[PDB]
């Protein structure tokens, strides 16, 4: 059904390729933590290309024409727009199925986030090559919401710690229960047939 994807440590084009392929099949995919999506190359080059993209505008009326979003979620949504056939009611329905968010929403705090191995910085890039941060680029050009998103991100990280301590306590309790006795009769079946 829903595919909640991490954005921490992913690449823009690779993640956009996998999302734009999997959204045409019907799986409702949502890319969360979009401010952490890395872009290869130099950061001066990335902001120079984005400055050229801002320079591209209609001269007779800039409103009727090129729109230039500054938020990184809308940057990734434009990246998936430029790959889906959005002028037809296949890519238009796919962009209606696609949802993108900066930070993490409260349902996606609770729901588990997936990590795509094919789009990772470590898998795809040589570790001695330069990179950038899409949230850093967005804060440098236009998107003035880094200080609020980072504060709410630290808040949900504190929430995640105070949940993970309870989860690890319950895991220690259930492994004490597994350490206890009189469960091995089924384990004679299970260890033979793939414990």
């Amino acid at each position: 059904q829903v595919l909640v994807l991490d954005g921490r440590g992913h690449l823009l084009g690779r993640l956009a390729a996998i999302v734009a392929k999997q959204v045409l099949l019907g799986r409702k995919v949502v890319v969360v933590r979009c401010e952490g999506i890395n872009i290869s190359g130099n950061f001066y080059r990335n902001k120079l290309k984005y400055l050229a993209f801002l320079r591209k505008r209609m001269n007779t009326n800039p409103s009727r024409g090129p729109y230039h979003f500054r938020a990184p979620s809308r940057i990734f949504w434009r990246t998936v727009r430029g790959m889906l056939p959005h002028k037809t009611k296949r890519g238009q329905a796919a962009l209606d199925r696609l949802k993108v968010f900066d930070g993490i929403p409260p349902p996606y705090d609770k729901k588990k986030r997936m990590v795509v191995p094919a789009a990772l910085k470590v898998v795809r890039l040589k570790p001695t090559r330069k990179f950038a941060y899409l949230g850093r680029l967005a804060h440098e050009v236009g998107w003035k919401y880094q200080a609020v998103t980072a504060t709410l991100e630290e808040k949900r990280k504190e929430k995640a710690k105070i949940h993970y301590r309870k989860k690890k306590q319950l895991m220690r309790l259930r492994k004490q229960a597994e350490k206890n006795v009189e469960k091995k009769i089924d384990k004679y079946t299970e260890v033979l047939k793939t414990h």
């Binding site: 990590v115 191995p117 470590v122």
Partner: protein, 175 residues
């Protein structure tokens, strides 16, 4: 040539036609690296037409045979001589390759020349292939592979492009 896949070594002997002006041709012999025997025969005609007064019509090929490796299970050192034609002018070259077999070493020679010097199979003319032993290698790469009790780990070994599921909770580590 194409040098498609791995290469193969062919011993090709060829002579002129028996003429009443001069019988018993000298029956020359070459060592042609080629993907198959037809390309070996054609490249043999090319080299012997370069060297002596020979062509395909006034001559013949007596025998064209596969040359198997004398010791495939030994990691050996091969010096390759090159007569490659660059963009401005042609140049001679001596290269060294540490590999198992002669055909594999000449295969790596073609691939490495096409990698670095942008040389096609049109321009590369293998002059000579000779196995050299240790303490004669001119190159620092083969000289630093000359190490007994050699040690190296494999840092940052990433693999399995989408053999794992495309959507997982994992965050894959290296080494």
């Amino acid at each position: 040539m194409k040098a498609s896949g791995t290469l193969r070594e062919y011993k090709v002997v060829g002579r002129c036609l028996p003429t009443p002006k001069c019988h018993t041709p000298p029956l020359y012999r070459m060592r042609i690296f080629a993907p198959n025997h037809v390309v070996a025969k054609s490249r043999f005609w090319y080299f012997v037409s370069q060297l002596k007064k020979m062509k395909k019509s006034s001559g013949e090929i007596v025998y064209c045979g596969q040359v198997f490796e004398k010791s495939p299970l030994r990691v050996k050192n091969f010096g390759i001589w090159l007569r490659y034609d660059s963009r401005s002018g042609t140049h001679n070259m001596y290269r060294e390759y540490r590999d198992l077999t002669t055909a594999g070493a000449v295969t790596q020679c073609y691939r490495d020349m096409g990698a670095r010097h942008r040389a096609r199979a049109h321009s590369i003319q293998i002059m000579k292939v000779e196995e050299i032993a240790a303490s004669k290698c001119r190159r620092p790469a083969v000289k630093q592979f000359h190490d007994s009790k050699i040690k190296f780990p494999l840092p940052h070994r990433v693999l399995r492009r989408q053999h794992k599921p495309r959507f997982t909770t994992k965050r894959p580590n290296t080494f």
